[PDB]
Symmetry: D2
Subunit: 328 residues, 4 copies
């Protein structure tokens, strides 16, 4: 059987309450032992080890945990015995973690993120099936060199493309600019596409000596907008600002003036959009070269923030950062 | 022929350059005369008058223009001769203006907003067809008491439900929580549903004596979030804050603490979501009663902001504002 | 507590195996007693009675069962004590049954159809939550006069609009031309729209004395198509044919010739589309008046078949049937 | 400039009426000269030659035209000077032609299909932009070895995945199981994914000596279904039958019996679904091995028909054809 490590970042996503007997096997973490008792079929698929990386809701995630997680995944995948890693994660910020890992994990071995939109104690809990399917995706031969993926609701999503698009639905994850790369239905894994954007082993980013990430704020645009939030971000030491613009990345005029001042001060200003899908394009209404801004193209604000944080570990140059957005 | 007024808020959405002869008829505004020359078939459908309300891109919209527009629409629809109004508008913030009018226009006569995702001078410009269809919707007997609608890409969307969900596509408008209420295909209008949430003549809001709207800021949530933007909004005199939360409206802990302090000071804090669709629900992970927050339910951040601005013209009471979010 | 009857058309959609004790209460049907044991929370919401109408997979449905079901629902809802009916049904043809009931049930009281895309013995079975939500929708005051609805995956779909759009997903039901009319999330029911097309008490159709429905076949169009299936339908005594055309209802020329001959013989030919969404329109490429065909407008082939079957109980007149398609 | 050939299969998709002067250049086909006059910017991108392959609406397409087109495309792409082919085509059956070419063109050079949902003479015609973008996709370096693509509405779709999913909308094309592989916005081409299913140079099929394709019929399933259409297809010499089944490919019992008899006679029976998306899976409710059927997995009925036609040029063996459906 293949060997896989499950890294937990919070509580259990499958099952509820205490186990009906004390397991003889310890996987290495109580959360993971609880998963193996809730979804016993996973033991027939792989030898499972477990680790508790953090113990939080995903809305409490920080860069410090991202760095810890990425360094550990890199260590685990460098081991000959370890065939893949599965990370159990809260759904709220799963897309941000997945995208961060997709640029920092230096391996072709599968890395699968999975969660649950319903509590494990709920009627019709989705966690058990989501986990079972995640293990099957982690051990599949075709999963190699696909990048980091999210497995939810019988679907396999590329980390660059995935987002949570609904507050409550079991089918909340989507890839609105490209679609799922594959499917997993009662453990049967099939891929139909793959990303052509560089990831994992092909990424230029290396976080192995980084202890803290650069500060990047996100602003939400609207009619009758303001300069005071730009100013407060600058005052708090923001190294970058993602602006979630109206339509195709458009600012209100007062805010634009403030962003232009931020960019001149050396804070990188990257234009995204509040709309949900599509590219925030170059050479539309905003003269990015004249103002000193980067266009984020086909991302969203929260994933753009992750990429700009990584870029800022290397450079604050506008052209070099535009090239990063136009590559990854 | 029915009499309709077209109100322009910027430039032409159809045609490009100068007219091939000087019209004998003036509709009342040069922009509208240019529309009638670009889409001459509309003159066979209605007697068209025109007015220029503002001359801006929609990313430059302000509450002052919203108030001017709402008061003028109410004046026009009070005239016996005027059967409907059409408003030409930039796409970026069309959903905000439409939602504002849906709660402030005191009439059952149709109010249609229309725009264009491509320039009128572009190949395959969408403005001419969008406008032709908009006039057909405005004059249709079934359009009475539907509320304010957006007509784009052969679709009729209810203002409560409509949003721009893509940066560039001609089909960028959607109603992600309910779908379009009708269709309009080469001018043939058909309704399949109507909103059951109160609007227009049934709305409690009245802006006839309001000269300035309450300040309401929007915040974009993310991992490793901050208190400084909350604090800057408070300092700039925000009467309300929309928080675009992670997942089902969840804040990061530092931010939650700052929002709790805002709410205690009498600034209304309303929880929405950054995700794009679904309800930001009551009685999920955030104890709204204990912290002093409102749940915005099935809106999005930018329409929640419009409703909170209107609510704040009447009250800052938490319970009363929750009832308003649960009604409209 | 309100009184509701659950009518089963096959097996259980929630739970698996035998009950852990023999219930003292009999609801009136073993399948329903099994549902009450699998989802005990439903007993706190309503007094439940049960009946077994048929015992089949939905792919085995026949007009005979539709007639039995419709007559029984009409009898139950005529009783003062009965507040609503819930029908448990296989997903495959749930849309056809729902649409048939929406034109034949002469009552404003709620009629809710519900099923499960996963077996009740599966990990993460959706039936328990789907049923719980269905009962909550059946007892809600706002559900009155909404027509027949389908409740799946936390969504409320109007029967006229609903379809199964995916082979396996828990989120397979959709309303592709209009969207869901409401939501139901852990039993909390909210409506946002309603149909404006006539249904239930406002329908002209009455099946109380009908023992067998007219035969209507469906044909699937494609390049290099044929006349032999039209001919075989005619030979088998088809009273109507739904043609699932290419694009906006277009036939291949050989097939068109055969359909024109069918229509001249008195068999009603109604044009739908194989594409999945949108209206099959009048006055596009096919001259329906000259050829003797009906355009089905905003339906799909299988729901068009249901409406044409009902129309054929009354008339074979082309204009009268076009009016039926353009009304319901 | 790169040299590209445009092959027309019907009339012009852009422009309308006569040219304002007689061109000095002939591209080689009057339809193509009319395109170059309607969209003159294309002449700055490439040296364009033109050919008229057929003169029909796409609803009149036959296997004979598919064979002529595939052989000609193979001849052209074997020429050193020819960098790509563009094919103008009716939208109704564009997905079938594209899928056929994707399995029969023996080249990595780009092959782009393009059409228009509105007439060139319409207001807001989409053909001019669609064609401009199609030429930009054809000449882009990243378009090599992507397989055959459909370019519509600013989107690049893989032929294996693309379908017309709406009767009338300009955004009618979709890839419901995977999404678009790239974008093209005012000629700026970007790819985000590529198909991992074999195509073009990697396909086993070769049509160079085939003069007529095997007959394959499609049947539309429904409640109270019949055996007479199966029987008529057999009688007309069908070598294969695609069954568009209820839900996950389920037949009605009478029909299943007739299909079992067909399969025993050596007619290949392949199960697809009427639903619109998802896989028609193996090992669900239908025992394919026992009955002698193939599961078409993640296609739709009309593309399953194209693949079964090509499979039947080589074999009628059940297992071998299941492998073909599981590969391509
Ligand atoms: N708030 C939870 C949501 C979930 O996991 O569904 C989390 O993000 O940790
Ligand atoms: N930025 C423009 C976009 C458009 O109209 O499409 C506006 O909102 O005014
Ligand atoms: N074939 C089953 C499918 C389901 O219920 O999910 C039925 O239609 O009865
Ligand atoms: N019926 C036309 C439709 C179009 O091109 O949009 C065809 O397929 O040729």
């Amino acid at each position: 059987k293949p060997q896989v490590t499950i890294l937990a970042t919070g509580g259990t996503i499958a099952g509820s309450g205490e186990s009906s007997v004390k397991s003889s096997y310890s996987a290495g973490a109580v959360t993971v032992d609880k998963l193996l008792a809730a979804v016993p079929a996973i033991n027939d698929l792989a030898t499972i080890k477990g680790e508790q990386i953090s113990s939080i809701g995903s809305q409490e995630m920080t860069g410090k945990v991202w760095l810890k997680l990425a360094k550990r995944v890199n260590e685990l995948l460098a081991q000959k015995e370890t065939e893949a890693v599965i990370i159990t994660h809260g759904t709220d910020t799963m897309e941000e973690t997945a995208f961060f890992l997709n640029l920092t994990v230096k391996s072709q071995k599968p890395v699968v993120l999975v969660g649950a939109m319903r509590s494990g104690s709920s009627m019709s809990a989705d966690g058990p099936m989501n986990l079972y399917n995640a293990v099957n995706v982690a051990i599949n031969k075709a999963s190699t060199n696909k990048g980091v993926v999210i497995v939810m609701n019988d679907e396999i999503h590329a980390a660059r493309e995935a987002t949570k698009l609904n507050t409550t639905a079991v089918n909340a994850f989507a890839s609105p600019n490209t679609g799922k790369i594959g499917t997993v239905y009662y453990g049967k894994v099939e891929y139909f596409t793959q990303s052509v954007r560089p990831h994992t082993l092909a990424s230029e980013f290396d976080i192995s000596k980084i202890e803290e990430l650069p500060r990047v704020d996100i602003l939400y645009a609207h009619p009758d907008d303001t300069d005071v939030l730009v100013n407060a971000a600058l005052q708090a030491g923001a190294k970058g600002i993602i602006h979630a613009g109206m339509g195709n990345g458009n600012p209100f005029p007062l805010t634009q003036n403030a962003l232009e001042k931020a960019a001149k001060s050396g804070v990188v200003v990257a234009r995204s959009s509040r709309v949900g899908s599509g590219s925030t394009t170059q050479e539309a209404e905003v003269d990015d070269k004249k103002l000193g801004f980067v266009a984020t193209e086909s991302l969203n604000p929260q994933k753009a923030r992750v990429l700009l944080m990584l870029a800022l570990t290397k450079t604050s140059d506008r052209e070099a950062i535009q090239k990063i957005f136009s590559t990854y």
